[PDB]
mmCIF file of C-alpha atoms in Angstrom:
data_model
loop_
_atom_site.group_PDB
_atom_site.id
_atom_site.type_symbol
_atom_site.label_atom_id
_atom_site.label_comp_id
_atom_site.label_asym_id
_atom_site.label_seq_id
_atom_site.Cartn_x
_atom_site.Cartn_y
_atom_site.Cartn_z
ATOM 1 C CA UNK A 1 2.983 -0.231 -26.132
ATOM 2 C CA UNK A 2 0.937 -0.135 -22.925
ATOM 3 C CA UNK A 3 0.533 1.671 -19.606
ATOM 4 C CA UNK A 4 1.384 -1.140 -17.184
ATOM 5 C CA UNK A 5 3.395 -1.212 -13.950
ATOM 6 C CA UNK A 6 6.326 -3.463 -13.030
ATOM 7 C CA UNK A 7 8.155 -4.408 -9.785
ATOM 8 C CA UNK A 8 11.490 -3.083 -8.504
ATOM 9 C CA UNK A 9 12.982 -6.396 -7.384
ATOM 10 C CA UNK A 10 12.126 -10.084 -6.950
ATOM 11 C CA UNK A 11 11.896 -11.713 -3.535
ATOM 12 C CA UNK A 12 10.086 -14.072 -1.178
ATOM 13 C CA UNK A 13 7.937 -12.350 1.459
ATOM 14 C CA UNK A 14 7.402 -14.061 4.800
ATOM 15 C CA UNK A 15 3.763 -15.170 4.778
ATOM 16 C CA UNK A 16 2.517 -13.202 7.791
ATOM 17 C CA UNK A 17 1.859 -16.236 10.033
ATOM 18 C CA UNK A 18 5.387 -17.312 9.176
ATOM 19 C CA UNK A 19 6.815 -13.785 9.293
ATOM 20 C CA UNK A 20 5.595 -13.490 12.858
ATOM 21 C CA UNK A 21 6.841 -16.923 13.915
ATOM 22 C CA UNK A 22 10.284 -16.040 12.567
ATOM 23 C CA UNK A 23 10.203 -12.425 13.778
ATOM 24 C CA UNK A 24 9.616 -13.500 17.376
ATOM 25 C CA UNK A 25 12.031 -16.445 17.265
ATOM 26 C CA UNK A 26 14.810 -14.223 15.978
ATOM 27 C CA UNK A 27 14.013 -11.181 18.107
ATOM 28 C CA UNK A 28 13.952 -13.286 21.268
ATOM 29 C CA UNK A 29 17.041 -15.143 20.060
ATOM 30 C CA UNK A 30 18.928 -11.843 20.117
ATOM 31 C CA UNK A 31 17.793 -10.641 23.552
ATOM 32 C CA UNK A 32 18.065 -14.103 25.118
ATOM 33 C CA UNK A 33 21.531 -14.528 23.638
ATOM 34 C CA UNK A 34 22.530 -10.987 24.513
ATOM 35 C CA UNK A 35 21.834 -11.799 28.151
ATOM 36 C CA UNK A 36 24.338 -14.660 28.104
ATOM 37 C CA UNK A 37 26.703 -15.300 31.004
ATOM 38 C CA UNK A 38 29.715 -14.822 28.742
ATOM 39 C CA UNK A 39 28.195 -11.756 27.079
ATOM 40 C CA UNK A 40 26.916 -10.044 30.242
ATOM 41 C CA UNK A 41 30.310 -10.489 31.897
ATOM 42 C CA UNK A 42 31.904 -9.160 28.700
ATOM 43 C CA UNK A 43 29.485 -6.234 28.348
ATOM 44 C CA UNK A 44 32.369 -3.798 28.820
ATOM 45 C CA UNK A 45 34.914 -6.053 27.116
ATOM 46 C CA UNK A 46 32.769 -5.847 23.985
ATOM 47 C CA UNK A 47 31.728 -2.202 24.332
ATOM 48 C CA UNK A 48 33.980 0.121 26.325
ATOM 49 C CA UNK A 49 31.386 2.705 27.299
ATOM 50 C CA UNK A 50 32.210 4.031 30.760
ATOM 51 C CA UNK A 51 30.604 7.397 30.006
ATOM 52 C CA UNK A 52 28.943 7.689 26.539
ATOM 53 C CA UNK A 53 27.085 4.375 26.777
ATOM 54 C CA UNK A 54 27.042 2.361 30.010
ATOM 55 C CA UNK A 55 23.645 0.724 29.450
ATOM 56 C CA UNK A 56 22.532 0.229 25.852
ATOM 57 C CA UNK A 57 19.975 -2.564 25.554
ATOM 58 C CA UNK A 58 20.646 -4.628 22.456
ATOM 59 C CA UNK A 59 16.910 -5.056 21.878
ATOM 60 C CA UNK A 60 16.449 -1.305 21.495
ATOM 61 C CA UNK A 61 19.772 -0.864 19.692
ATOM 62 C CA UNK A 62 19.653 -3.872 17.289
ATOM 63 C CA UNK A 63 15.865 -3.718 17.136
ATOM 64 C CA UNK A 64 14.688 -0.266 16.041
ATOM 65 C CA UNK A 65 12.658 -1.135 12.930
ATOM 66 C CA UNK A 66 9.552 -3.345 13.403
ATOM 67 C CA UNK A 67 10.714 -7.011 13.435
ATOM 68 C CA UNK A 68 7.434 -7.963 11.769
ATOM 69 C CA UNK A 69 9.049 -7.486 8.363
ATOM 70 C CA UNK A 70 10.677 -10.524 6.781
ATOM 71 C CA UNK A 71 11.457 -10.335 3.088
ATOM 72 C CA UNK A 72 14.256 -11.856 1.041
ATOM 73 C CA UNK A 73 15.465 -9.435 -1.613
ATOM 74 C CA UNK A 74 16.747 -11.738 -4.342
ATOM 75 C CA UNK A 75 17.845 -9.729 -7.409
ATOM 76 C CA UNK A 76 17.166 -6.001 -7.662
ATOM 77 C CA UNK A 77 15.812 -4.958 -11.051
ATOM 78 C CA UNK A 78 15.650 -1.245 -10.258
ATOM 79 C CA UNK A 79 12.940 -0.597 -12.849
ATOM 80 C CA UNK A 80 15.026 -2.562 -15.330
ATOM 81 C CA UNK A 81 17.551 0.279 -15.103
ATOM 82 C CA UNK A 82 20.332 -1.829 -13.572
ATOM 83 C CA UNK A 83 20.346 -3.719 -16.860
ATOM 84 C CA UNK A 84 20.536 -7.502 -17.010
ATOM 85 C CA UNK A 85 17.513 -7.959 -14.753
ATOM 86 C CA UNK A 86 15.420 -8.179 -17.916
ATOM 87 C CA UNK A 87 17.395 -11.138 -19.271
ATOM 88 C CA UNK A 88 17.099 -12.988 -15.961
ATOM 89 C CA UNK A 89 13.594 -11.640 -15.370
ATOM 90 C CA UNK A 90 12.410 -13.847 -18.218
ATOM 91 C CA UNK A 91 14.117 -16.886 -16.628
ATOM 92 C CA UNK A 92 11.699 -19.800 -16.971
ATOM 93 C CA UNK A 93 12.601 -20.799 -13.412
ATOM 94 C CA UNK A 94 12.149 -17.338 -11.884
ATOM 95 C CA UNK A 95 9.358 -16.060 -14.150
ATOM 96 C CA UNK A 96 7.366 -19.243 -13.540
ATOM 97 C CA UNK A 97 8.355 -19.375 -9.860
ATOM 98 C CA UNK A 98 6.557 -16.091 -9.148
ATOM 99 C CA UNK A 99 3.184 -16.515 -7.453
ATOM 100 C CA UNK A 100 4.267 -19.864 -6.031
ATOM 101 C CA UNK A 101 4.737 -20.368 -2.297
ATOM 102 C CA UNK A 102 7.822 -21.983 -0.786
ATOM 103 C CA UNK A 103 9.337 -22.407 2.654
ATOM 104 C CA UNK A 104 12.733 -20.944 3.510
ATOM 105 C CA UNK A 105 15.506 -22.940 5.158
ATOM 106 C CA UNK A 106 17.697 -21.250 7.740
ATOM 107 C CA UNK A 107 20.838 -22.994 8.970
ATOM 108 C CA UNK A 108 21.800 -20.401 11.571
ATOM 109 C CA UNK A 109 20.969 -16.925 12.822
ATOM 110 C CA UNK A 110 23.259 -13.912 12.604
ATOM 111 C CA UNK A 111 23.571 -11.068 15.089
ATOM 112 C CA UNK A 112 25.308 -7.733 14.676
ATOM 113 C CA UNK A 113 25.349 -4.284 16.349
ATOM 114 C CA UNK A 114 23.458 -2.676 13.449
ATOM 115 C CA UNK A 115 22.538 -5.868 11.592
ATOM 116 C CA UNK A 116 20.908 -9.177 12.463
ATOM 117 C CA UNK A 117 19.162 -11.926 10.555
ATOM 118 C CA UNK A 118 19.105 -15.569 9.535
ATOM 119 C CA UNK A 119 21.327 -17.548 7.158
ATOM 120 C CA UNK A 120 19.447 -19.165 4.275
ATOM 121 C CA UNK A 121 20.801 -22.120 2.300
ATOM 122 C CA UNK A 122 20.510 -21.922 -1.481
ATOM 123 C CA UNK A 123 19.078 -25.182 -2.796
ATOM 124 C CA UNK A 124 17.743 -26.130 -6.237
ATOM 125 C CA UNK A 125 15.216 -23.287 -6.255
ATOM 126 C CA UNK A 126 17.726 -20.592 -5.287
ATOM 127 C CA UNK A 127 20.424 -22.195 -7.440
ATOM 128 C CA UNK A 128 18.274 -21.862 -10.560
ATOM 129 C CA UNK A 129 17.408 -18.320 -9.483
ATOM 130 C CA UNK A 130 21.141 -17.539 -9.324
ATOM 131 C CA UNK A 131 22.222 -15.384 -12.316
ATOM 132 C CA UNK A 132 25.546 -15.960 -14.073
ATOM 133 C CA UNK A 133 26.513 -12.436 -12.989
ATOM 134 C CA UNK A 134 26.694 -13.406 -9.312
ATOM 135 C CA UNK A 135 29.059 -16.289 -10.114
ATOM 136 C CA UNK A 136 32.149 -14.168 -9.526
ATOM 137 C CA UNK A 137 32.307 -12.414 -6.103
ATOM 138 C CA UNK A 138 33.195 -8.729 -5.718
ATOM 139 C CA UNK A 139 36.976 -8.882 -6.040
ATOM 140 C CA UNK A 140 36.694 -12.038 -8.152
ATOM 141 C CA UNK A 141 38.920 -13.966 -5.741
ATOM 142 C CA UNK A 142 36.770 -17.072 -5.303
ATOM 143 C CA UNK A 143 35.208 -15.281 -2.318
ATOM 144 C CA UNK A 144 32.390 -17.163 -0.506
ATOM 145 C CA UNK A 145 29.257 -16.907 -2.722
ATOM 146 C CA UNK A 146 25.809 -16.273 -1.263
ATOM 147 C CA UNK A 147 25.074 -12.545 -1.426
ATOM 148 C CA UNK A 148 21.386 -13.472 -1.187
ATOM 149 C CA UNK A 149 21.899 -16.213 1.411
ATOM 150 C CA UNK A 150 21.236 -13.602 4.099
ATOM 151 C CA UNK A 151 17.815 -12.525 5.350
ATOM 152 C CA UNK A 152 17.328 -9.287 7.327
ATOM 153 C CA UNK A 153 15.657 -9.302 10.750
ATOM 154 C CA UNK A 154 17.142 -6.630 13.036
ATOM 155 C CA UNK A 155 19.164 -3.452 12.455
ATOM 156 C CA UNK A 156 20.323 -0.480 14.559
ATOM 157 C CA UNK A 157 20.347 3.259 13.814
ATOM 158 C CA UNK A 158 23.885 2.900 12.433
ATOM 159 C CA UNK A 159 22.933 0.110 10.001
ATOM 160 C CA UNK A 160 24.924 1.517 7.081
ATOM 161 C CA UNK A 161 24.498 0.071 3.548
ATOM 162 C CA UNK A 162 28.270 -0.210 3.151
ATOM 163 C CA UNK A 163 28.809 -1.792 6.573
ATOM 164 C CA UNK A 164 26.289 -4.563 5.980
ATOM 165 C CA UNK A 165 27.956 -5.290 2.654
ATOM 166 C CA UNK A 166 31.506 -5.697 3.928
ATOM 167 C CA UNK A 167 30.553 -7.199 7.292
ATOM 168 C CA UNK A 168 28.380 -9.717 5.443
ATOM 169 C CA UNK A 169 30.951 -10.707 2.825
ATOM 170 C CA UNK A 170 34.004 -10.539 5.111
ATOM 171 C CA UNK A 171 32.300 -12.531 7.866
ATOM 172 C CA UNK A 172 31.389 -15.154 5.268
ATOM 173 C CA UNK A 173 35.068 -15.498 4.327
ATOM 174 C CA UNK A 174 36.315 -16.215 7.853
ATOM 175 C CA UNK A 175 33.559 -18.751 8.537
ATOM 176 C CA UNK A 176 34.571 -20.351 5.255
ATOM 177 C CA UNK A 177 38.083 -20.889 6.583
ATOM 178 C CA UNK A 178 36.729 -22.542 9.718
ATOM 179 C CA UNK A 179 37.627 -19.533 11.865
ATOM 180 C CA UNK A 180 34.481 -17.541 12.495
ATOM 181 C CA UNK A 181 32.201 -18.865 15.199
ATOM 182 C CA UNK A 182 33.336 -19.553 18.759
ATOM 183 C CA UNK A 183 30.860 -21.441 20.943
ATOM 184 C CA UNK A 184 30.250 -18.702 23.489
ATOM 185 C CA UNK A 185 26.469 -18.962 23.825
ATOM 186 C CA UNK A 186 24.572 -22.149 24.603
ATOM 187 C CA UNK A 187 20.973 -22.151 23.364
ATOM 188 C CA UNK A 188 18.334 -24.817 24.184
ATOM 189 C CA UNK A 189 17.593 -24.899 20.449
ATOM 190 C CA UNK A 190 21.261 -24.860 19.446
ATOM 191 C CA UNK A 191 24.312 -22.735 20.219
ATOM 192 C CA UNK A 192 25.892 -19.346 19.521
ATOM 193 C CA UNK A 193 29.087 -19.036 17.517
ATOM 194 C CA UNK A 194 31.167 -15.860 17.750
ATOM 195 C CA UNK A 195 31.202 -14.703 14.147
ATOM 196 C CA UNK A 196 34.098 -12.411 14.986
ATOM 197 C CA UNK A 197 35.182 -9.941 17.634
ATOM 198 C CA UNK A 198 32.008 -7.969 16.988
ATOM 199 C CA UNK A 199 29.590 -10.419 15.335
ATOM 200 C CA UNK A 200 27.596 -13.432 16.582
ATOM 201 C CA UNK A 201 25.744 -16.415 15.092
ATOM 202 C CA UNK A 202 23.266 -19.086 16.204
ATOM 203 C CA UNK A 203 23.216 -22.590 14.725
ATOM 204 C CA UNK A 204 19.664 -23.931 14.736
ATOM 205 C CA UNK A 205 19.277 -27.563 15.815
ATOM 206 C CA UNK A 206 16.365 -28.203 13.446
ATOM 207 C CA UNK A 207 16.884 -25.214 11.181
ATOM 208 C CA UNK A 208 14.222 -22.537 10.717
ATOM 209 C CA UNK A 209 11.737 -23.240 7.939
ATOM 210 C CA UNK A 210 9.144 -20.568 7.166
ATOM 211 C CA UNK A 211 6.465 -20.096 4.485
ATOM 212 C CA UNK A 212 7.162 -17.429 1.850
ATOM 213 C CA UNK A 213 5.809 -16.433 -1.568
ATOM 214 C CA UNK A 214 7.849 -15.428 -4.619
ATOM 215 C CA UNK A 215 6.915 -12.079 -6.128
ATOM 216 C CA UNK A 216 8.210 -8.697 -7.221
ATOM 217 C CA UNK A 217 7.551 -5.424 -5.422
ATOM 218 C CA UNK A 218 8.090 -1.900 -6.762
ATOM 219 C CA UNK A 219 6.538 0.438 -4.216
#
């Protein structure tokens, strides 16, 4: 009926000034934490590279793409091809939320070899923006919900789409059972919890609140 253009997915972009504040905080949080006494002394213990890699700076490894990009990808519409997006797209809460600005709330920061970001808590706004399709996890075993409760900040050259999916969901499960976060990194603004023999997390003392705007981007 008309020649108009539509977005690919809904999300909250990090309002530049905020994007930067969060991009630096997180980026530095990774390098500062990476240079921990426990980490430095466990450099080999964590990565046994006595030939292939005997000096791989985390900053360069877990920080290839420009950190000045902070965007929360809520639900992907995929040009309304994925089906369902349309039904939710009309959501009075989401549809009306678009264009409005809101600050994000991060409880802790996550670090990974090829992934790294901040944990966002779903409140009333995110709750209403939660479709009834995301109610049941992947296996449908009451797995820890919150597939959107994860914002991207840093990723390596090996940042695989399948790795981030499992590592994100699995890691959420362990932490749910109170066994995923060993205090092995003291931070003036909080502490670092080992999110698993391979992952790390940082619990903010005053959380990380940034200014974002709800909108949909296609390309």
